[PDB]
Amino acid sequence: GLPLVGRVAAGEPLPAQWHIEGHYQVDPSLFKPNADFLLRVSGMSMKDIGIMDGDLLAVHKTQDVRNGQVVVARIDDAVTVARLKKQGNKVELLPENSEFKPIVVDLRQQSFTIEGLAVGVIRN
Amino acid sequence: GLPLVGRVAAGEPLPAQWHIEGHYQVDPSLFKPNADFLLRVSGMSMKDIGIMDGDLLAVHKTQDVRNGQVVVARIDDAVTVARLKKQGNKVELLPENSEFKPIVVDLRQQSFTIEGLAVGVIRN
């Protein structure tokens, strides 16, 4: 149905090499854009918009996203989910939780890859 | 497929004549116990546990749910979702948001229906 391929950090980016863990029979269409894969969230950085550690994050595999959206970003194979805010060569990955702080990423100091766009949560 | 039968208030119990509004292709087996139907959440009373306004709440239909669990209950024909705590003929419906107050129900005073157990969330 829809494949689970690993985790993503809702806090300090954790490293991870994704591979199919399981399959959830869920109409990928329920999400807009359609959901391509799932990631087990780990952390409470995004708890204010309802994303909880342990939740499955539905993601649409894309490479272009606009500010204010919420994406799954990888840095040195360390993945994290947060609200984007690119400006010049600097990229801010903002959280949804007061106890946490943003995470600036310099495009000319390190490699930055957008893994996808957050299009919905699943919690069972 | 999973049937959406209407709204549920994550706050003050709201009036709702449940009726099959749609079907979501989502294995009922993904939740434990199996989900029998969905509800549209309305309000922020259960925000502290990730249940946000607009969220689809999975529900297993049963009358017998125990203290501490999140239930879907009906009072004066209006439905709500909250944490359960029943002692004798006094039932408390607790929220998950400091901004809201708990609801008290005296079983000698009125009819009290437990629609089902909340067992999941889908956000799309």
Swiss-Prot record, chains A, B:
Disruption phenotype: Cells are filamented, accumulate DNA double-strand breaks, have viability defects at 10 ng/ml ciprofoxacin. Synthetically lethal in combination with a priB deletion. GO terms for cellular component: cytosol; protein-DNA complex. The record marks A10, G11 as: Cleavage. It is an enzyme of class 3 (hydrolase). The keyword DNA damage applies. The active site is at S45, A82. One of its GO terms (molecular function) is identical protein binding. Its EC number is 3.4.21.88. It catalyses: Hydrolysis of Ala-|-Gly bond in repressor LexA. Coiled coil: none annotated. Represses a number of genes involved in the response to DNA damage (SOS response), including recA and lexA. Binds to the 16 bp palindromic sequence 5'-CTGTATATATATACAG-3'. In the presence of single-stranded DNA, RecA interacts with LexA causing an autocatalytic cleavage which disrupts the DNA-binding part of LexA, leading to derepression of the SOS regulon and eventually DNA repair. Implicated in hydroxy radical-mediated cell death induced by hydroxyurea treatment. Belongs to the peptidase S24 family. Homodimer. This is LexA repressor. The chain holds residues 75 to 198 of 202 of the full protein.
